[PDB]
Write a protein that binds this ligand. Structure first.
Ligand code: P34
Length: 165
């Protein structure tokens, strides 16, 4: 056996962003940034050909909803790309299509920022302001809709993934 090491910390809290125009000072309430570096996940209907080329881009870094509580409660275009600590959250998204695997620094830990008592706390969300560059997307597994399971012989690694710890 061996015990795991601690995580590298980038000076820039949105180092991972695919759209660097995001304005960290407009995030409300004051963000509590994730400091761990385990695999995160994102259920998305968008296909890997697109995600591996572009990364995850947010809907609207300019005029989107920068208030995290508002974004979480009432889905609206925002500067954030949502991910989760929970490998299995894809089972709750119908027509999910894909479970993406993400190894990215930072992100806003939603429950540490707005509390763990709101309606969607069990999503254990990490919100990435400005999204996530493709170099931080490990890969993807397609999801079988009828059983809500991963088609594990059809997982694909992202050729652009760059390990960093
Ligand atoms: C960037 N938009 C396409 C995303 C959207 O409007 N909703 C959305 C779309 C996909 C999402 N996927 C997730 O894995 C997730 C995990 C924790 C919390 C939220 C999500 C999530 C939310």
């Amino acid at each position: 056996k061996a015990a795991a090491p601690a995580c590298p910390r980038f000076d820039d809290p949105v180092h991972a962003a695919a759209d660097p125009r995001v304005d960290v000072e407009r995030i409300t309430p004051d963000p509590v940034w994730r400091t761990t570096c385990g695999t995160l996940y994102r259920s998305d209907s968008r296909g890997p050909a697109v995600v591996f080329e572009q990364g995850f881009l947010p809907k609207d870094v300019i005029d989107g909803q920068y208030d995290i509580e508002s974004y979480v409660l009432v889905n609206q275009p925002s500067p954030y790309v949502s991910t989760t600590y929970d490998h299995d959250l894809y089972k709750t998204w119908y027509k999910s299509g894909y479970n993406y695997y993400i190894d990215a620094p930072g992100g806003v830990d939603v429950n540490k920022t707005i509390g763990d008592r709101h309606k969607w706390a069990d999503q254990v969300e990490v919100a990435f302001p400005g999204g996530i560059r493709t170099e931080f997307v490990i890969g993807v597994c397609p999801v079988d809709k009828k059983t809500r399971t991963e088609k594990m012989s059809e997982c694909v690694g992202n050729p652009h993934y760059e390990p960093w710890h």
